[PDB]
């Protein structure tokens, strides 16, 4: 309670700042300021996890061998993808597989 | 194997740019909020929200490090990492952040 609203406004403030950074072509330096190298790497790898989960060809073990992501990391990704709204999942199939 | 792989560094960078482009396009069709719930943890989202306030108060230059720690619950190492990163930011970014964050 209470703090949850505080955190939500703080998160939306970031979302809006980055929204406007993309509009002004400052998104790349903004994301270098706001994220660590390891965090950027994780996000690049999470995209590939989403891609290969949507593609449906690799087992969890095969996805681990390809990406270096452990079984628990892949399971986190699968559970998050199952939780995503349908419209996002359908769009991701289009953007990441074609 | 190379002591330092420039090839792997660039491959990782392309993976990062793929995310950046994915999120750019999600902003254009109002899928950015669900995309960020998919791609980030709650703790990571909270950290990003807190980092915005660290930048704001560092640019403002008013609060001490003790005041910033007390206000945000952010250790000295966290405040220092943000100050160091602010030092590496390009002038165009710092000027824009001043315009947007400082009223
Ligand atoms: C796709 C994917 C793969 C691994 C992951 N680890 C943590 C997250 C954030 C969950 N909202 C994640 C997402
Ligand atoms: C502004 C701020 C505050 C605290 C932080 N901790 C880690 C980072 C990412 C560094 N590029 C960061 C940025």
From Swiss-Prot, chain A:
Keywords: Cytoplasm, DNA-binding, Repressor, Transcription, Transcription regulation
DNA-binding as UniProt keyword: yes
DNA-binding region: 60-83
Gene Ontology biological process terms in this record: negative regulation of DNA-templated transcription; regulation of DNA-templated transcription
Tagged with keyword Ribonucleoprotein: no
GO cellular component: cytoplasm
Subcellular location: Cytoplasm
Pfam families (UniProt xref): Trp_repressor (PF01371)
Gene Ontology molecular functions: DNA binding; DNA-binding transcription factor activity; sequence-specific DNA binding
Superkingdom assignment: Bacteria
NCBIfam families: TrpR
Subunit (UniProt): Homodimer.
Protein family membership: Belongs to the TrpR family.
Protein purpose: This protein is an aporepressor. When complexed with L-tryptophan it binds the operator region of the trp operon (5'-ACTAGT-'3') and prevents the initiation of transcription. The complex also regulates trp repressor biosynthesis by binding to its regulatory region.
Protein name (database record): Trp operon repressor
Organism whose genome encodes this protein: Escherichia coli (strain K12)
Gene responsible for this protein: trpR
């Amino acid at each position: 309670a209470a703090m949850a609203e505080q955190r939500h406004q703080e998160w939306l403030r970031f979302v809006d700042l980055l929204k406007n950074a993309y509009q002004n072509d400052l998104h790349l330096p903004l994301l270098n300021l706001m994220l660590t190298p390891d965090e950027r790497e994780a996000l690049g790898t999470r995209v590939r996890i989403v891609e290969e989960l949507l593609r449906g060809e690799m087992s969890q073990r095969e996805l681990k061998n390809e990406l270096g992501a452990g079984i628990a990391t892949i399971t986190r990704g699968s559970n998050s993808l199952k939780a995503a709204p349908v419209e996002l999942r359908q769009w991701l199939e289009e953007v990441l597989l074609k």
